[PDB]
Amino acid sequence: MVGLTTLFWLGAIGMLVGTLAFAWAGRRYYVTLVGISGIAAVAYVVMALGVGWVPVAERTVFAPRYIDWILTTPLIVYFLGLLAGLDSREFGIVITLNTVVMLAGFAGAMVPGIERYALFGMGAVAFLGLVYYLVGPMTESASQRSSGIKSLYVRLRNLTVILWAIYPFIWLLGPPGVALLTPTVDVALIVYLDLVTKVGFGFIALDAAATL
Ligand SMILES: CCCCCCCC/C=C/CCCCCCCCOC(=O)[C@H](O)CO
Ligand SMILES: CCCCCCCC/C=C\CCCCCCCCOC(=O)[C@H](O)CO
Ligand SMILES: CCCCCCCC/C=C\CCCCCCCCOC(=O)[C@H](O)CO
Ligand SMILES: CCCCCCCC/C=C\CCCCCCCCOC(=O)[C@H](O)CO
Ligand SMILES: *C/C=C(C)/C=C/C=C(C)/C=C/C1=C(C)CCCC1(C)C
Ligand SMILES: CCCCCCCCO[C@@H]1O[C@H](CO)[C@@H](O)[C@H](O)[C@H]1O
Ligand SMILES: CCCCCCCCO[C@@H]1O[C@H](CO)[C@@H](O)[C@H](O)[C@H]1O
Ligand SMILES: CCCCCCCCO[C@@H]1O[C@H](CO)[C@@H](O)[C@H](O)[C@H]1O
Ligand SMILES: CCCCCCCCO[C@@H]1O[C@H](CO)[C@@H](O)[C@H](O)[C@H]1O
Ligand SMILES: CCCCCCCCO[C@@H]1O[C@H](CO)[C@@H](O)[C@H](O)[C@H]1O
Ligand SMILES: CCCCCCCCO[C@@H]1O[C@H](CO)[C@H](O)[C@@H](O)[C@H]1O
Ligand SMILES: CCCCCCCCO[C@@H]1O[C@H](CO)[C@H](O)[C@@H](O)[C@H]1O
Ligand SMILES: [Cl-]
Numbered sequence: 001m002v003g004l005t006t007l008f009w010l011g012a013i014g015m016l017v018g019t020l021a022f023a024w025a026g027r028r029y030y031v032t033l034v035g036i037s038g039i040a041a042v043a044y045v046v047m048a049l050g051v052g053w054v055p056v057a058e059r060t061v062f063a064p065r066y067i068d069w070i071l072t073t074p075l076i077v078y079f080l081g082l083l084a085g086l087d088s089r090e091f092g093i094v095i096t097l098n099t100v101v102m103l104a105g106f107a108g109a110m111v112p113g114i115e116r117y118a119l120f121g122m123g124a125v126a127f128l129g130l131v132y133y134l135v136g137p138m139t140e141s142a143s144q145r146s147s148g149i150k151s152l153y154v155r156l157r158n159l160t161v162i163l164w165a166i167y168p169f170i171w172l173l174g175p176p177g178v179a180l181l182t183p184t185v186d187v188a189l190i191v192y193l194d195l196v197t198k199v200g201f202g203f204i205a206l207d208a209a210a211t212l
Pocket of ligand 3: 019031032034035038039041042078088091092
């Protein structure tokens, strides 16, 4: 009743609507949000059209998903870094930590043997370091800003930390890991998370930009 392609089209539409909404409201932050959801829109369309479905051993890996993540997640971290007022050196640490997470996940998905769990573990370790920087140094830094900016940062940070922490569990329980969850359920869960961590993220920012 509900196929993989239908789910991909749903993600595509959701990202498209977010993209147009952000572009209009911007008639730096607004341009970043267009990139976050705009890139994801393209990845989902490609996947909806059946492009980039790589067979690996016994499972199917969706390559556009990881290219999406590698480009859009640093933009989310960048957005949060601007809110917190990071110096260009602090940016380098967190964006480097982020890229290690994304690359490790991409590589582990593409490896058929058990070495893929070794790649997954390395992404997990780097993710814990990324969480430390969001909850600590970047929160210290955001404190120096107005009360409204600091409030916005804390809200987006909380959304980001809680939801991003769920992805490694979905990956591990799905086809890439112990292939418990079926591809359809696993995809459905990730489409939901992608939409909330990108389009939901964006709309919470828009809401605060009008409350000024
Ligand atoms: C715009 C954000 C600016 C911040 C970004 C910071 C650094 C981003 C890191 C980029 C390196 C990503 C390499 C892409 C992998 C391409 C393999 C593609 O190969 C393939 O096609 C698959 O193997 C197919 O199965
Ligand atoms: C300065 C005041 C600004 C006030 C706000 C005005 C916003 C008007 C401009 C853009 C609206 C963006 C929402 C996208 C609607 C497209 C739905 C199109 O319907 C669909 O989604 C199709 O069925 C499938 O894509
Ligand atoms: C250390 C600090 C250095 C500062 C680094 C800044 C990095 C980020 C800078 C600008 C954000 C890039 C936005 C990309 C928009 C293009 C996607 C367009 O997406 C699309 O494909 C179409 O929209 C599809 O409809
Ligand atoms: C001031 C802003 C500066 C921004 C700097 C961002 C640069 C970060 C770039 C690359 C980080 C590479 C980490 C390599 C681990 C990837 C594991 C996956 O790789 C592998 O496992 C093997 O290579 C595959 O054979
Ligand atoms: C818009 C897309 C988003 C916000 C995607 C987020 C994805 C993650 C936080 C994934 C994290 C992973 C780990 C922590 C370990 C390795 C496997 C990953 C890539 C699923
Ligand atoms: C500052 C004006 C609003 C933000 C401009 C975003 C610049 C990136 O390009 C954007 O691509 C989108 C489609 O791919 C369009 O919807 C935007 O209008 C376009 O500006
Ligand atoms: C004058 C109104 C400008 C609208 C916002 C700036 C548009 C930025 O344009 C974007 O810049 C990127 C390079 O960083 C390119 O890769 C993108 O393709 C391009 O759309
Ligand atoms: C804004 C327009 C961006 C267009 C990006 C489309 C990327 C999908 O391009 C795809 O790349 C594959 C490479 O093997 C080919 O097999 C597919 O035929 C092709 O559709
Ligand atoms: C060669 C490996 C498969 C990738 C190429 C086949 C693409 C099949 O998909 C087609 O791609 C087109 C891209 O514009 C779409 O317009 C069509 O609606 C779609 O049916
Ligand atoms: C069959 C033996 C494994 C097949 C190839 C495993 C793929 C690991 O190579 C991966 O390719 C891409 C290159 O940047 C990225 O995903 C990763 O950086 C890299 O680890
Ligand atoms: C901009 C983000 C979307 C980029 C996704 C492009 C992924 C292309 O991926 C390709 O798809 C084809 C399968 O149909 C090829 O045959 C595969 O080998 C694969 O490399
Ligand atoms: C946002 C949409 C929610 C849909 C939740 C997923 C429920 C459908 O999950 C089912 O899984 C089976 C395999 O596991 C079938 O093969 C699928 O056809 C699908 O019907
Ligand atoms: Cl996958």
